[PDB]
Amino acid sequence: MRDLKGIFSALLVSFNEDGTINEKGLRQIIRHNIDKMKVDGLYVGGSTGENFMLSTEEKKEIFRIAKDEAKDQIALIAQVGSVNLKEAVELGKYATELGYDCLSAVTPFYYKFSFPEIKHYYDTIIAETGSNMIVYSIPNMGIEQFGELYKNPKVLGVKFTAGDFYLLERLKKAYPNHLIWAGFDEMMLPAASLGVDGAIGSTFNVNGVRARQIFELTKAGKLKEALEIQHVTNDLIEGILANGLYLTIKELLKLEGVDAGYCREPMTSKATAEQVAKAKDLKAKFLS
Amino acid sequence: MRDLKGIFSALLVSFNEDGTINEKGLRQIIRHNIDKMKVDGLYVGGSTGENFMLSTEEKKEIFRIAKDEAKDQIALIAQVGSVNLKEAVELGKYATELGYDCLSAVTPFYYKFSFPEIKHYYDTIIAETGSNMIVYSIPNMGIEQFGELYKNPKVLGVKFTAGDFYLLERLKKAYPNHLIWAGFDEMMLPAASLGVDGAIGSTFNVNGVRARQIFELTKAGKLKEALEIQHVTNDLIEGILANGLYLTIKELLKLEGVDAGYCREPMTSKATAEQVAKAKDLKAKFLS
Amino acid sequence: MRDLKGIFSALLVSFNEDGTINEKGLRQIIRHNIDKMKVDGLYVGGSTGENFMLSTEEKKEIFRIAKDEAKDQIALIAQVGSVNLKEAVELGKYATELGYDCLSAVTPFYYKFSFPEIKHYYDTIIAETGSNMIVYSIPNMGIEQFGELYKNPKVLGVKFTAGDFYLLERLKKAYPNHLIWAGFDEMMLPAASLGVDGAIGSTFNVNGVRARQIFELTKAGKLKEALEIQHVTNDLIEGILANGLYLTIKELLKLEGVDAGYCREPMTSKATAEQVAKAKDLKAKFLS
Amino acid sequence: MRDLKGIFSALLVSFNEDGTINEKGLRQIIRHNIDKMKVDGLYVGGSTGENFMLSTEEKKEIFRIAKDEAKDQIALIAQVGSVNLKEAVELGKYATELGYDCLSAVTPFYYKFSFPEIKHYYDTIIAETGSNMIVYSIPNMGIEQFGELYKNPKVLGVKFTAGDFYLLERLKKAYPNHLIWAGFDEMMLPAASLGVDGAIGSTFNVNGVRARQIFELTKAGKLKEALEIQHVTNDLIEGILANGLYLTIKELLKLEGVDAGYCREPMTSKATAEQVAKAKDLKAKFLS
Ligand SMILES: CC(=O)N[C@@H]([C@@H](O)[C@H](O)[C@H](O)CO)[C@@H](O)C[C@@H](O)C(=O)O
Ligand SMILES: CC(=O)N[C@@H]([C@@H](O)[C@H](O)[C@H](O)CO)[C@@H](O)C[C@@H](O)C(=O)O
Ligand SMILES: CC(=O)N[C@@H]([C@@H](O)[C@H](O)[C@H](O)CO)[C@@H](O)C[C@@H](O)C(=O)O
Ligand SMILES: CC(=O)N[C@@H]([C@@H](O)[C@H](O)[C@H](O)CO)[C@@H](O)C[C@@H](O)C(=O)O
């Protein structure tokens, strides 16, 4: 398959006021990422796409729209994990039939599942689809557990989201050919200093230019320039996080002419006047 | 409004080896709770029912089967919570149409929702279905937030799950006409000492006789008697938790002639010979 | 030798403005507890005593004063734990030589000690003094471990401080002859419903009368009455907590005529005008 | 003014079997660090020196010995924090009188202090001693709280111990002239990539040559090479942690001819045969 290293925006989805998918808006978000953010790929169906608040058919529709819009221009990873393994299988087959390059799957949540159940979960998704897989968990999983998961050759690596840099170094050390995508945009530099292979992030939807610079500069050992860019990026992320992550990134998109729509409920769907004013301010100070 | 105080078993569901619902087996679990455990009602669709691993259609099927088998012999509570509000509303409406007495919904999880989002979530389920509601959250939410939720008159009260007895006392003190259902079977006695109105539990599917005793004796001031029965119950409960909660209760049901079937994947579906043997010893010592 | 069951106030200490011990003030606190609060005993040098911010010599003067003031009128428990085992041994020996009825010692903190190191710590303080010992830890320690500590016959039981009501029933059940003192004043009722033998608490310095009531009514099966007294008590305790525990209890003692002094720095030593006014309102509402 | 940047070993202390300080041994640990590890300085009285298990007189003796042994060959920081603010003041004055370059102090612990209290503790220690200060806390306190601490111009910066690399970047961006010393030896590389000014660590007592290489190689933008040294360091560090941190580093020193003696009880004072064997193996693998 296609190279999966580098910069992947975790695709946001545009919703209408009633919560249905705004396909036109979604296509516009995709074009912005490919054409203007210059990403190496998209991670579709992740937490950033408001995946877990949608139906199975809704997830399928975004997968179809995203593939139809990006075609073969960029690499595409489909996040298909769920507490429902049958639905994870159904989505992984559908993504696979569409041509996604790889699957990703959150470890099953809500219940406290044991390691063997988690490993069976990933092995089943793999077996039923025939696709390669990128694992990840929500608030960890240690070196011994990664070794067991990595006994399946179709597990390519991990979307690392917890801020434990000793565990990140140990994983690269113990499983050096397995890939690591950093999931924390605001800690890209230190992640890249430990050799991650790429990054999957929500802020790359509007700050992809600087994210690629931090990455590439840090890999070149150009730390002082990389750090200046990480500092500006972090002022941007700090405002986005204080203002409302999802709504603020969609408002920033709308200021570039992307109809990024509303958020899906149970999330607050419409930005307040003050959230809107703050997004304009962030745009002015950092994306102008 | 049918009386909702008392002992409610959180209904377990029987699954075939392929993970599909075993309707015969589910009807036998329901008959055992009504006729042998003699519970006041069933809490259908909860975490004990393996609910969050299933599709919307399988959730509806379980609600169909449970209402058909129980008719109006006992009170029925439908748990319809989800990260997907549209699905919660759709499930709330179907359960309301089937004739469930009340609805229950877990606070939306996975994402970190704010309090207003959480209240908007419960207010929407109620307004779209017109039914009463029992709130609850997984791993708190304080007196001020419960008061806000209680501004909606259809919010009857809470299924209390975190072992914070100071908060339990405060909530009963502050809102004396709202109801509380203890969710921790092994802490029934102390909860009943602070005035809870009932209990919703997984172990009542096999230990409903003793659960009622502890509750009734504690409410009456017969503390010595209640505590001896809570001790024996906690010995059983300690063995069920060490042996595997879900499979053990199903193995205990099969020793009573109920086809409780398999667990649903991602959960470990089949009990090991060691787990079957331990269920047989627990049956012999505690439920014979 | 002497009975250790019942109500123990965790002795508060009076300090002057410069942080030195106000002996006259302390003796008055002791007098209020024995004569008005009618406690079965005092737990001296506990965290309520501002113990961990003082020197070894200051800890010794508090143990000399309390024993000289209380004489043989009430049971006395000396808390002598520390991160410094040589200090713990020194205090234990002194308290033993002053005539305290029993010792108590927090598990060594700061560092993460292993179970065996913790058992060796209690065993050493016992070996060096020959006194009975009441264990406790700050924020758990399970049944197995309590059984290991209880192999030493001088370990009488535990001052239970963590809100785990399931562990509390398991402990009492596994070791029916070992004693349990509830450390949480606001959860006295549910603790007494599971058979605890007494309580050690800071609010007994001002609410001693209602505390015995709750306890004695609850061991008597008069749960409706106990619950009411626990409700009023918890209104007082909530107000104490919100206003600042240590200074609020000292302001309340000052309202009875006890020179309870200032708090020792690094805690804020002096109450503000609002704290004093709130103490007065709590005097009027609950202790007049 | 003595430059405080760079590599600081957190000095280990040699104890006799009875727990008293082994002066000869301690001076051999000091000489090894100056002469063999080539550290820029020592951080004396830290948790690595087993400080919190000792008496105030013992702490003072350690300060006297380290300063008499190191003279002015290196920088010296004295950690004098305590839950006892008068003890903190007393220790700070003594260290200042001995010529220590700077003081450092843990946030007071055991109790839950407010921020105002914590700032008052630091201001008092400073005001009473006349010395500069390096703050630190145990397991976070944000940007806004470090700004308030830094209103006191004698607070030089922080010994950063929590693995939050976002906060670390934020701190350096908000107070670019204040210093940061990384406290996690296993994450030196990522910390140096964000511009920390130095590092304080326990493993530099045996791994000082590599620690300096990582630090200096990372500042030079030689990330590939720094990473390889961080990788072997971390295999050593992983083995030290698994085998018992303090005892393994002391056992490692003993194989270098340093009488590092025993640990101080409540910590296990003597290494077992297995711990001795594992230190010899770690010595052969990484430090020969
Ligand atoms: C929890 C979360 O939102 N994580 C983001 C980060 O990009 C995050 O948004 C960003 O670092 C701000 O904290 C991505 O890792 C999530 C991405 O992996 C996804 O599944 O959508
Ligand atoms: C997480 C969990 O298992 N909770 C159980 C308890 O009955 C629990 O099984 C029992 O106390 C054993 O710990 C119920 O509260 C869950 C019940 O409310 C449900 O929603 O299914
Ligand atoms: C941490 C704490 O303050 N606990 C108090 C409680 O009485 C407490 O003050 C009360 O329950 C209010 O929360 C006592 O248990 C402490 C007491 O055992 C002591 O050692 O002084
Ligand atoms: C908690 C702890 O042991 N921290 C060490 C680290 O060097 C640690 O030993 C090392 O990173 C291994 O985890 C030092 O930061 C402690 C040092 O700051 C001290 O105060 O002695």
How many CB atoms are located within 10 Å of the residue D263 CB? Answer: 24
Residue with tokens 């005092």: C42
Q: Could you tell me if D199 and D158 are in contact, meaning their C-beta atoms sit under 8 angstroms apart?
A: no
CA B228 to ligand 3 centroid distance, Å: 29
Q: Report the residue of C51, C86, C121, C241 to disrupt the D interface, i.e. the one with the largest count of D CBs within 10 Å.
A: C86
Tell me if chain D has a CB within 8 Å of the CB of A216. Answer: no
Residue with tokens 């067991």: A148
Give CA–CA dist C234/C218, Å, rounded.
16
Q: State the virtual CA torsion across D210, D216, D220, D223 in degrees, nearest 10.
A: 30
For chain D, the straight-line distance linking the first and the last C-alpha, in angstroms and rounded, comes to: 37
For chain C, the straight-line distance linking the first and the last C-alpha, in angstroms and rounded, comes to: 37
SS3 state of residue C144:
helix
Strand partners, C6: C198
Q: State the virtual CA torsion across D155, D161, D164, D170 in degrees, nearest 10.
A: 20
Tell me if chain A has a CB within 8 Å of the CB of B73. Answer: no
Q: Is the dihedral of CA C270, C271, C273, C276 positive or negative?
A: negative
Q: Could you tell me if B159 and B134 are in contact, meaning their C-beta atoms sit under 8 angstroms apart?
A: yes
Give CA–CA dist C181/D240, Å, rounded.
40
Give CA–CA dist A66/A26, Å, rounded.
8
- 3-state SS of C187-252 is HHHHHHHCCCCEEEECCHHHHHHHHHHHHHHHHCCCHHHHHHHHHHHHHHHHHHHHHCHHHHHHHH
Domain boundaries, chain A: 1-288
Tell me if chain D has a CB within 8 Å of the CB of C84. Answer: yes
Q: Which residues have C-beta within 8 Å of that of residue B145, sequence separation ≥ 6?
A: B115
Tell me if chain A has a CB within 8 Å of the CB of B257. Answer: no
Tokens of B81: 């919570």
DSSP B135-182: EE------HHHHHHHTTSTTEEEEEE-S--HHHHHHHHHH-TTSEEEE
Looking at ligand 3, which residue's alpha carbon is closest to its atom 15? C183
Which residues in C lie closer than 8 A to residue B222 (C-beta atoms)?
Answer: 221
Tokens of D194: 């964000």
Q: Which residues have C-beta within 8 Å of that of residue C99, sequence separation ≥ 6?
A: C67, C76
Q: How far is CA A90 from CA A57, A113, B84, D95, in A?
A: 10, 21, 18, 68
Radius of gyration, alpha carbons of chain C: 18
Largest CA distance in chain A: 52
Q: Could you tell me if A169 and A143 are in contact, meaning their C-beta atoms sit under 8 angstroms apart?
A: no
Helices (H), chain A: 23-31, 56-70, 85-98, 115-129, 143-149, 165-174, 188-193, 204-219, 223-243, 245-254, 273-286
How many CB atoms are located within 10 Å of the residue C285 CB? Answer: 12
Whether B121 sits among the annotated catalytic residues: the reply is no
Q: Is D57 exposed, middle or buried (0-12, 13-18, 19+ CB in 10 A)?
A: exposed
List the one residue out of B128, B55, B68 whose CA is nearest residue B100. B68
A155-160 and A179-182 strand pairing: parallel
Q: How far is CA B106 from CA B64, B235, C160, D280, in A?
A: 21, 29, 32, 55
Nearest chain B alpha carbon to A121: B266
Q: Which residues have C-beta within 8 Å of that of residue B83, sequence separation ≥ 6?
A: A52, A53, A266, B108, B109, B110, B111
Give CA–CA dist B100/B76, Å, rounded.
5
Strand partners, B42: B9, B76
How many CB atoms are located within 10 Å of the residue C93 CB? Answer: 17
CA A53 to ligand 2 centroid distance, Å: 24
Answer yes or no: is A144 a known binding residue. no
According to DSSP, residue A104 is labeled E
Q: Is the dihedral of CA C243, C244, C247, C248 positive or negative?
A: positive
Q: Report the residue of B84, B90, B113 to disrupt the A interface, i.e. the one with the largest count of A CBs within 10 Å.
A: B84
Give CA–CA dist D117/D95, Å, rounded.
23
- C227 vs B164, B194, B222: nearest CB: B194
List b or e across C159-183, with b for residues whose CB sees 16 or more CB atoms inside 10 angstroms. Answer: bbbbbbbbbbbbbbbebeebbbbbb
Which residues in B lie closer than 8 A to residue C190 (C-beta atoms)?
Answer: 165, 190-191, 193-194
How many CB atoms are located within 10 Å of the residue A232 CB? Answer: 15
List the one residue out of D2, D132, D156 whose CA is nearest residue D72. D2
Give CA–CA dist D283/D265, Å, rounded.
25
Q: Which residues have C-beta within 8 Å of that of residue C193, sequence separation ≥ 6?
A: B189, B190, B193, B218, B223, B227, C218, C223
Cα angle vertex B266, ends B260, B271, to 5°?
Answer: 40
Chains A, D in contact, 3 or more Cβ pairs below 8 Å? yes
Tokens of D215: 């630090």
DSSP chain B: -----EEEEE----B-TTS-B-HHHHHHHHHHIIIII--SEEEETSGGGTGGGS-HHHHHHHHHHHHHHHTTSSEEEEE---S-HHHHHHHHHHHHHHT-SEEEEEPP-SS---HHHHHHHHHHHHHHH---EEEE------HHHHHHHTTSTTEEEEEE-S--HHHHHHHHHH-TTSEEEE--GGGHHHHHHTT--EEEESTHHHHHHHHHHHHHHHHHT-HHHHHHHHHHHHHHHHHHHHH-HHHHHHHHHHTTT----BPPTTS--S--HHHHHHHHHHHHHH--
Q: Which residues have C-beta within 8 Å of that of residue D185, sequence separation ≥ 6?
A: D199, D201, D202, D203, D204, D207, D211, D233, D237
Strand partners, A213: none
Give CA–CA dist C199/C212, Å, rounded.
9
CA D174 to ligand 1 centroid distance, Å: 24
Q: How far is CA C213 from CA C30, C39, C160, in A?
A: 21, 12, 20
List the one residue out of B237, B252, B251 whose CA is nearest residue B287. B252
**CATH architecture of structural domain D1-288:** Alpha-Beta Barrel (3.20)
- 3-state SS of D43-89 is EECCHHHCHHHCCHHHHHHHHHHHHHHHCCCCEEEEECCCCCHHHHH
Give CA–CA dist C199/C221, Å, rounded.
18
Strand partners, C9: C42, C201
Q: Could you tell me if B191 and B184 are in contact, meaning their C-beta atoms sit under 8 angstroms apart?
A: yes
How big is chain C, counted in residues?
288
Chains C, A in contact, 3 or more Cβ pairs below 8 Å? no
Give CA–CA dist C212/C109, Å, rounded.
32
Give CA–CA dist B109/B84, Å, rounded.
10
How many CB atoms are located within 10 Å of the residue C243 CB? Answer: 22
Q: Which residues have C-beta within 8 Å of that of residue D270, sequence separation ≥ 6?
A: D17, D262, D263
Q: Could you tell me if D193 and A189 are in contact, meaning their C-beta atoms sit under 8 angstroms apart?
A: yes
Strand partners, A157: A134, A179
CA B26 to ligand 2 centroid distance, Å: 18
Contact B52 A266 (CB under 8 A): no
List b or e across A100-137, with b for residues whose CB sees 16 or more CB atoms inside 10 angstroms. Answer: bbbbbbbbbbebebeeebbbbbbbbbbebbebbbbbbb
Q: Is the dihedral of CA A260, A262, A268, A271 positive or negative?
A: positive
Give CA–CA dist A7/D3, Å, rounded.
41
Question: Looking at ligand 2, which atom is closest to the CA of residue B51?
Answer: 21
Q: After which residues do gaps appear in chain A, with C to N over 2.5 Å?
A: 139
Angle between helix axes A223-243 and A204-219 (nearest 10 degrees) is 160
How big is chain A, counted in residues?
288
For chain A, the straight-line distance linking the first and the last C-alpha, in angstroms and rounded, comes to: 37
Give CA–CA dist B255/B199, Å, rounded.
25
Residue with tokens 């050799």: A195
Answer yes or no: is B193 a known binding residue. no
Tell me if chain A has a CB within 8 Å of the CB of B265. Answer: yes
Resolution (A): 2.0
Tokens of C2: 């002497």
Give CA–CA dist D132/B66, Å, rounded.
72
List the one residue out of A259, A255, A261 whose CA is nearest residue A19. A261
Give CA–CA dist B275/C5, Å, rounded.
43
Tokens of D209: 């040559």
Give CA–CA dist D121/C265, Å, rounded.
8
Largest CA distance in chain B: 52
List the one residue out of D169, C221, C175 whose CA is nearest residue A238. D169
Q: After which residues do gaps appear in chain C, with C to N over 2.5 Å?
A: 139
DSSP C88-134: HHHHHHHHHHHT-SEEEEEPP-SS---HHHHHHHHHHHHHHH---EE
Radius of gyration, alpha carbons of chain B: 18
SS3 state of residue A154:
coil
Give CA–CA dist C22/C262, Å, rounded.
9
Of residues A67, A119, A159, A172, which has the active-site annotation? Answer: A159
Identify which of B11, B44, B47 to mutate to test ligand 2's pocket (most ligand atoms within 8 A of the CB). B47
Tell me if chain D has a CB within 8 Å of the CB of A166. Answer: yes
Give CA–CA dist B166/A208, Å, rounded.
49
Question: Looking at ligand 2, which atom is closest to the CA of residue B48?
Answer: 21
Looking at ligand 3, which residue's alpha carbon is closest to its atom 14? C201
Contact B165 C224 (CB under 8 A): no
Residue C210 one-letter amino acid: R
For chain B, the straight-line distance linking the first and the last C-alpha, in angstroms and rounded, comes to: 37
Size of interface A-B (CB pairs under 8 A): 79
According to DSSP, residue C51 is labeled G
DSSP chain D: -----EEEEE----B-TTS-B-HHHHHHHHHIIIIIS--SEEEETSGGGTGGGS-HHHHHHHHHHHHHHHTTSSEEEEE---SSHHHHHHHHHHHHHHT-SEEEEEPP-SS---HHHHHHHHHHHHHHH---EEEE------HHHHHHHTTSTTEEEEEE-S--HHHHHHHHHH-TTSEEEE--GGGHHHHHHTT--EEEESTHHHHHHHHHHHHHHHHTT-HHHHHHHHHHHHHHHHHHHHH-HHHHHHHHHHTTT---BBPPTTS--S--HHHHHHHHHHHHHH--
Question: What element of type H or E holds C9?
Answer: strand C6-10
Angle between helix axes D204-219 and D245-254 (nearest 10 degrees) is 100
Angle between helix axes C273-286 and C245-254 (nearest 10 degrees) is 60
Give CA–CA dist A263/A269, Å, rounded.
4
How big is chain B, counted in residues?
288
Q: State the virtual CA torsion across B157, B160, B165, B169 in degrees, nearest 10.
A: 10
The structure was resolved experimentally with: X-ray
CA A237 to ligand 1 centroid distance, Å: 11
Q: How far is CA B73 from CA B40, B44, B49, B95, in A?
A: 9, 15, 20, 17
Question: What element of type H or E holds C31?
Answer: helix C23-31
Looking at ligand 2, which residue's alpha carbon is closest to its atom 9? B202
Tokens of D148: 């308030």
Q: Could you tell me if B41 and B74 are in contact, meaning their C-beta atoms sit under 8 angstroms apart?
A: yes
Whether A159 sits among the annotated catalytic residues: the reply is yes
Give CA–CA dist B224/A212, Å, rounded.
69
Q: Is B177 exposed, middle or buried (0-12, 13-18, 19+ CB in 10 A)?
A: exposed
Nearest chain C alpha carbon to B171: C231
Question: Looking at ligand 2, which atom is closest to the CA of residue B138?
Answer: 1
List the one residue out of A210, A165, A169 whose CA is nearest residue A218. A210
Q: Is the dihedral of CA A30, A36, A37, A41 positive or negative?
A: positive
How many CB atoms are located within 10 Å of the residue A160 CB? Answer: 27
Give CA–CA dist C186/C208, Å, rounded.
13
List the one residue out of A264, A116, A239 whose CA is nearest residue A186. A239
Give CA–CA dist B78/B66, Å, rounded.
10
SS3 content of chain A, % helix, strand, coil (to 5): 55, 15, 35
Q: Is the dihedral of CA B244, B249, B253, B258 positive or negative?
A: negative
Give CA–CA dist B237/B245, Å, rounded.
9
SS3 state of residue A69:
helix
SS3 state of residue A47:
helix
Question: Looking at ligand 1, which atom is closest to the CA of residue A237?
Answer: 12
